[PDB]
Amino acid sequence: LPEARKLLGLAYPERRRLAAAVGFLTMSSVISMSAPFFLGKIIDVIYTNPTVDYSDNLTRLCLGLSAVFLCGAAANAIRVYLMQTSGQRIVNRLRTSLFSSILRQEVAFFDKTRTGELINRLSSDTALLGRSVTENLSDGLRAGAQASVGISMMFFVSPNLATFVLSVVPPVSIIAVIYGRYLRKLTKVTQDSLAQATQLAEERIGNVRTVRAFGKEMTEIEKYASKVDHVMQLARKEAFARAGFFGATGLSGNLIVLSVLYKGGLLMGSAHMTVGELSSFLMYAFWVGISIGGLSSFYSELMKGLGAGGRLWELLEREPKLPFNEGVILNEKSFQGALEFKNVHFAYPARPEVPIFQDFSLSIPSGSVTALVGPSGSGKSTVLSLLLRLYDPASGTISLDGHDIRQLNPVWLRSKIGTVSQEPILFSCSIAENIAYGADDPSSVTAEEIQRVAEVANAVAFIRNFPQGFNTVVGEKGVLLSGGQKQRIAIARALLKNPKILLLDEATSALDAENEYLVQEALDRLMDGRTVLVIAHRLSTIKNANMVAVLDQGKITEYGKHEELLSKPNG
């Protein structure tokens, strides 16, 4: 019931197009159901009057039927168009609405939901739902109307023959459903066995180095051969049941038709029916058969659409656990760029058992370079995720110029913070579009502005050296870039953003010699006159930093100047 109201509201903006096409469907289906009745009358006319010339009647009827078909073709053409376009408009609304809900969700949601599932819900499930209220609804409506008129016309033509069909088909159908359920079981048994054998195959192929190492290729080959030779034994049993079922289905189908031809034939000779009347009944019986299969198919697709519906309403009505674009903004005067971690406790949502910060307190003063030092896996990169408010701490507070970052507008907060990652991420756009991404309006930035920041970032040389220049499509689906090239485009993107706070994640595994000089020069121009928090692995950056913070087991164990920290009581 609550799912039905959601499906009705989905079709509601297209109600006039769908009703017009339903009108065309109703007409086409009803006028078409007249053909067995009128063909029954024409059959009896020829039979009664074999001596009469019907040339003018045939020509007048065929010219009449030609115009009816031309109208029928135009009606069907208009109907298909209205149904396809209505579905397209429904799917379009579902695509834009779903993608909007997804991007508004917190990072933690993406941590527990695979991109593949979100894309499957965006591609497959939106297509299902769209046609389920349109094309599927028309299919089930046509089949439902044709079964109704068909059964009614069977009882109209002959109540005796119709009651007979009604007493024979249901018992046969119930027995066929029991045989069909047994056949489904034997198929699962064969396909479970086959799945096991393919998992074995996939595991051994994927880990062929370990298989070689232990000289087990011949062993695995024979292990797999035994599994698939067993699948063959299960498939033989499934084939025997399927053969016996197709034989039983075929026999029953033929003997039911034969019973109607026989009973009908007897009723003809008894003067209860005519040859044409029997032809009507058989034609209507064939139509009901097709209409039953049509309703059956409609039901399968209705279920698939309802299943897809639940998966979409689940994301569309999902409220993010972190504010999207809501909170305060600070004026030019009260914003200085000072940050403060105060007794911060945090564990990732995917691994809540593993604590990252255990009473983490750090003061990053305005315009000062703070160097974050610690062992690999200590949780240095987690500091950047918390400052951008990708996640909220479990306990403690993160403050910007005395304000808890939870009170600020997150979109605004992130506009004041720039980041240059260990492994920069570039989308499959032009180099210019990737650089423009820094700006609050990437459409407003001029070609001259993209060139300026590219020169400062020591990127302008390799970019112009590319055949397409700034229009070179990069990312995964485009032209591949070196680590240092990606980093300089990231520095260009940061430069254009022009943040007061800058967060730097240095590479522990240092890049090439020629890159490492051009990148260090660009990083220094980017660090100038900004609040910098650097996760450093180079002794040159720690020495030049205003203060050094040592992260050991989720807490700041040591805090002071590089010289003061090195000149510890034990040295």
Ligand X SMILES: CCCCCCCCCCCCO[C@@H]1O[C@H](CO)[C@@H](O[C@H]2O[C@H](CO)[C@@H](O)[C@H](O)[C@H]2O)[C@H](O)[C@H]1O
Cα separation, 127 vs 134, in Å, equals: 11
Number of H-type helices and E-type strands within the chain = 20, 10
For ligand X, the binding residue among 13, 247, 265, 402 (CB under 6 A) is: 265
Contacts (CB under 6 A) with ligand CDL, residues 217-276: 248-249, 252
122 binds, among ligand CDL, a copy of itself, Mg ion, none (CB under 5 to 8 A by kind): a copy of itself
Cα separation, 302 vs 128, in Å, equals: 9
- Closest approach, Cβ 428 to ligand ACP, in A, equals 23
- Residue 373 phi, psi (nearest 5): -115, 140
CA distances from 167 to 173, 253, 287, 409, 450 (A): 11, 14, 18, 71, 81
Nearest residue relative to ligand X (C-beta): 265
**Does residue 111 interact with ligand ACP by CB under 6 A?**
yes
455 binds, among ligand CDL, ligand ACP, Mg ion, none (CB under 5 to 8 A by kind): none
DSSP 476-545: SSS----HHHHHHHHHHHHHHH--SEEEEE--SS---HHHHHHHHHHHHHHHTTSEEEEE--SHHHHHHS
The structure tokens listed for 6 are 């959601």
For ligand ACP, the binding residue among 16, 321, 351, 464 (CB under 6 A) is: 351
Q: Residue 58 or 119: which CB sits closer to ligand X?
A: 58
Q: Are 134 and 87 in contact (CB under 8 A)?
A: yes
For Mg ion, the binding residue among 274, 381, 397, 421 (CB under 5 A) is: 381
- Closest approach, Cβ 235 to ligand X, in A, equals 29
Q: Residue 155 or 427: which CB sits closer to ligand X?
A: 155
Q: Residue 17 or 380: which CB sits closer to ligand ACP?
A: 380
Closest listed residue to residue 501, CA positions, set 374, 379, 389, 359 = 389
**Does residue 509 interact with ligand X by CB under 6 A?**
no
Closest listed residue to residue 389, CA positions, set 407, 364, 367, 371 = 407
CA distances from 380 to 111, 363, 533 (A): 19, 15, 11
End-to-end CA distance of the chain: 75
Binding site for ATP, by residue number, is 377, 379-382
Q: Are 433 and 474 in contact (CB under 8 A)?
A: no
567 binds, among ligand X, ligand CDL, a copy of itself, none (CB under 5 to 8 A by kind): none
Contacts (CB under 6 A) with ligand X, residues 52-91: 54, 58, 61, 65
- Residue 25 phi, psi (nearest 5): -65, -45
Binding site for biliverdin IXalpha, by residue number, is 249
Contacts (CB under 6 A) with ligand X, residues 16-55: 42, 44, 46-48, 50, 54
- Closest approach, Cβ 36 to ligand X, in A, equals 12
Q: Residue 178 or 261: which CB sits closer to ligand X?
A: 261
Cα separation, 137 vs 321, in Å, equals: 37
Number of residues near Mg ion (by CB under 5 A): 2
Cα separation, 263 vs 479, in Å, equals: 76
**Does residue 379 interact with ligand ACP by CB under 6 A?**
yes
- Closest approach, Cβ 55 to ligand X, in A, equals 8
**Does residue 350 interact with ligand ACP by CB under 6 A?**
yes
- Closest approach, Cβ 71 to ligand CDL, in A, equals 17
CA angle 553, 558, 563 (to 5 degrees): 140
Q: Are 227 and 193 in contact (CB under 8 A)?
A: yes
Cα separation, 431 vs 349, in Å, equals: 34
Contacts (CB under 6 A) with ligand CDL, residues 148-187: 159-160, 163-164, 167-168, 171-172, 175-176, 179
Instruction: Give the per-residue contact string, 129-168, with ligand X (x = CB under 6 A; - = no).
Output: -------------------------------x-------x
Q: Where are the beta strands (DSSP E) in 328-416?
A: 339-347, 355-364, 369-373, 395-400, 403-404
Q: Residue 272 or 321: which CB sits closer to ligand X?
A: 272
160 binds, among a copy of itself, ligand CDL, Mg ion, none (CB under 5 to 8 A by kind): ligand CDL
Q: Residue 97 or 422: which CB sits closer to Mg ion?
A: 422
Closest listed residue to residue 374, CA positions, set 557, 571, 561 = 557
- Closest approach, Cβ 268 to ligand X, in A, equals 4
Neighbours of 3 (CB within 10 A): 12
Q: Residue 207 or 471: which CB sits closer to ligand ACP?
A: 207
Note the residues at the interface with ligand X (CB under 6 A). 42, 44, 46-48, 50, 54, 58, 61, 65, 160, 168, 172, 252, 255-256, 259, 261-263, 265-272, 274-276
Note the residues at the interface with ligand ACP (CB under 6 A). 111, 348, 350-351, 356, 376-382
Note the residues at the interface with ligand CDL (CB under 6 A). 159-160, 163-164, 167-168, 171-172, 175-176, 179, 248-249, 252
